[PDB]
Symmetry: C4
Subunit: 315 residues, 4 copies
């Protein structure tokens, strides 16, 4: 279609501009020290470069196994790879955590189901291979930023629900999430039209590529559609009033309240400054507010982990 | 206009040559060690990449707060960004100072007022957010090189004057400048025609883009026009007889004398060598003369700071 | 020939894609620490950049001489150079070994004989110059990956056989191989047609360029053709069921058994994961399975070396 | 001229190939550790990027001043800059020496006189500014490689001769050379036609551009033409039988013998290997033969320096 190939070309130009911004940022930014990484593991029998993951660890491990963080990167479902959030992942690992971050195939080559299947395959891989190399899968923090927060919010629900597992064509994995931390999530993509910005303007096209025309995906594209009826882990919602997607965070809180989700928040006020933009704590680990946000996340995780251990007579 | 687009194309080719020279220099130059930086903070609600700043600090801080240096880079008003003077800024930070350096929009997309507004917004940002992350704003060194020295000289006057604040559309910031150090400033751009070089030849075009046709800017483009009637901080004028803009420094001294400005100088004689070119102490921090110049600046600042503390019964 | 230049263009496009993958991997991968290298030694009187080698050593040597590892890189006979396996070579050196890795001219500019002559010239160079700079040539591990495993398997036979030396136009070198370790070798290239993949599909073209039309090369292209009648060193076969060339490893084992070759294996099962792809232990030294594989190789070498020293009344 | 612009284009293509080889080498080569450099000093009042120099020093200085090495790079008079020999210069500095290396304008934009004037201006600069930053100019080693060895051999003669100073339009500098070390020099360019290689084939064109049509330059292009009648420092001739310019070294020895020049040699035999190519000790500081060669040079220098100090009642 004329207009369709044009719409794709517009979306790809927006992400090419982002790409240049990301490259310029990483060329200058301080890198977290005292971390080791293992790169480019295939998580299935495929040569698709996106179906790969990275693992990150502190350079000196206190213990043979460390609590796990699993990161799902953002980029509007159309952009990104396992290296995009490398500095944020190194930061978390430097705090004493075993961290995994995966690639997933991008729209428009797959739809939302292909993305969810890729993520569940990376989790399944980790359930087989993680413990032997340092991952404690009894204590798992699942986190995602922006479109990655959308995906993380869906994965958290799918993991609890046999029906959603069938619809998305995945099996449950043999570990649970201790905490699910969403950073400026786009968890209600059907509301994208009522805000301003590039994604919101192009919204119907994003929604179409996410669903791939499958009405079952249309009916399960939003957290508010997959949350119903499930007993979920606790959530932590991170962001702020200077997030260009703040309306999404406001919408998500209402979904949380209506569904009796257990959550805490770290939402920065506008008064804390204009620099606390969309996903600032992921893009600039080194800023003081980013350190405060990220440590607050890890401390929430640790508190939930400790409670679980007391509960399981394993303190 | 035919000739106007041609004149712009000539100026941009000169700065593209400079750009290549700067890239080649930074690829080789020693980098100051033992410094941390925090990059790419937006200082207002904008995605304009120029409306961002960097912060620099010693890697090991003696104290929770350190005296402040705020750097305004040069580049003829048409060139540069927050990274241009990164090695010079790291050097100063390595001496035990909290340093901020800002981007500002470039001609011909803005005029002088837009540049001044950007600088005051970065200062305002720092007044809100700096102290919480290490900046002592009771002791502030404002410095600029070349066109950045012009801008610094204007900002120093505007900060003291309600009338100039109104004309430039800025509010005063809630800290003062302890010392204003100008390195090979172009503080009297209306005199650009009486010297030789690329900028001088293209002078009327520079002056036009600086004023943006606004006669109030034409009447306040030169330090000699904004200095009148104000009680100013002390100045330090750095440069030398091998500065291609030495005539500007000579002109500025006469303005200083006529207006009873408090100043000291560090002007290198021709006998100290041909390498002590325009802004040499900013471009090559590592040279012995650069270290001597830069430490002499920091020691002048420290002496003025100590006197202020004695005066304020806070030694 | 129309079709011939087309077939070459297809092979070169496949290797250009590999090349990009290799560059992306090396840009991110951790580098082994505590190693020194000496680069770009010519091993004959030639300015052909491929007729050069690198040497690698631990940064702090326990001893004046260290046991030797000699690495022959892969790349389908059409691709690669002395830098391709640099991280794998550094890893081995970091374990206390003096390592040499050579370039060799590539198809279609030479044929298999030119490749074998280049390798023997690098070995001859090392026999003249290695000991003076740290190589213990009484204990030598010869290793190759993929096409490099093919080449290593042939070199091991040629070194033992006056007749093959004459056919390949090389002289024996004045040291022996303690162990020959093949990593996912393509040691039976004539069987390439009975598997799937790029190389297998283009097989007849690979075989033609390897032989250069020389029927004596056609009759000695496969390990099974050069193994006959010789007393060989011990071999170690490394790979696994997720190697895209696993059928080659299966074929080689049958050749080993039929010819009473002394060997051990380190073949990973499919259950050990999809990431244990072709030559994974060479491409990602840092992974735990790679470390286990590579140390197991070095320990086999060390055990064979110790036995030799006991046998030679030199323990 | 048609043929002249063609000949220049051929020479520039040869040097562009060399340039790529040099870039590939520096991307991989180990860099000497524990050195500081100061870059891009202009040595005259010019913005010509070639009329600049670098200074190199050990990172921790034993003493306030260190013996001096001054390096003149090669590149056929048509190629190179102050960064070309940076690793070799760092190596020498790491041994406890203050090292200067200069750019000089390249053929065909200047002729030999312009090159000699640039070199003498860098020496004059150092005589004014070197001691204040660590250079001991009582003990000076002058070294050059290939075309840089030609230039060094001429500079050594010119410095001793009022007549050659007048012809080349330079003044003597206020220090002497303790030793002049030539590495694979092309000191008799008029003999270039009787060897093989790119430079030799294009020889008449090189000779024309060197002389710039000036018959006084034609009569003083060769060391054998400037050596006559002068009392010279001692020389050290470095190279070997695998230098593609070995015939030049053989020719120079005959000139040395005929003119009663004081010299020593470090000429490697062919038996020491094919890797000991033209200027190998400059291109690969890290090789054992390079370290041996370079330390032997520095020890010869030190011995000559000590003798001078005993002679001057200053031990
Ligand atoms: Ca544990
Ligand atoms: Ca303080
Ligand atoms: Ca030994
Ligand atoms: Ca001394
Ligand atoms: Cl790492
Ligand atoms: Cl940093
Ligand atoms: Cl190294
Ligand atoms: Cl340095």
């Amino acid at each position: 279609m004329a207009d369709e190939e044009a719409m794709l070309a517009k979306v790809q130009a927006s992400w090419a501009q982002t790409a240049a911004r990301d490259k310029a940022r990483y060329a200058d930014e301080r890198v977290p020290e005292d971390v080791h990484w293992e790169t480019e593991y295939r998580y299935e029998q495929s040569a698709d470069p996106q179906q790969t993951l990275n693992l990150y660890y502190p350079a000196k491990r206190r213990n043979a196994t460390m609590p796990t963080v699993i990161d799902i990167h953002g980029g509007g479902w159309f952009y990104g790879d396992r290296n995009l959030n490398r500095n944020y992942c190194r930061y978390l690992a430097s705090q004493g955590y075993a961290v995994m971050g995966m690639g997933y195939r991008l729209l428009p080559d797959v739809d939302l189901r292909g993305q969810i299947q890729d993520i569940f395959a990376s989790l399944r891989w980790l359930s087989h291979f993680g413990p032997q190399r340092g991952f404690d899968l009894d204590h798992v923090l699942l986190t995602g930023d922006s479109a990655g927060g959308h995906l993380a919010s869906l994965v958290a629900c799918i993991q609890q629900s046999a029906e959603l597992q069938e619809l998305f064509g995945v099996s449950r994995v043999n570990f649970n999430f201790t905490l699910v931390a969403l950073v400026c999530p786009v968890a209600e993509p059907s509301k994208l039209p009522e805000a301003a910005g590039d994604m919101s303007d192009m919204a119907a096209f994003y929604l179409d590529k996410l669903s791939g025309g499958d009405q079952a995906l249309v009916d399960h594209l939003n957290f508010s559609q997959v949350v119903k009826g499930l007993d979920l882990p606790p959530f932590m919602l991170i962001g702020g009033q200077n997030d260009s997607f703040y309306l999404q965070s406001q919408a998500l809180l209402k979904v949380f309240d209506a569904n009796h989700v257990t959550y805490t928040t770290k939402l920065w006020p506008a008064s804390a400054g204009p620099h606390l933009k969309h996903v600032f704590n992921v893009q600039h680990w080194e800023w003081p507010e980013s350190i405060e946000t990220n440590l607050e996340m890890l401390r929430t995780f640790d508190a939930l982990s400790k409670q679980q251990d007391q509960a399981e007579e394993n303190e």
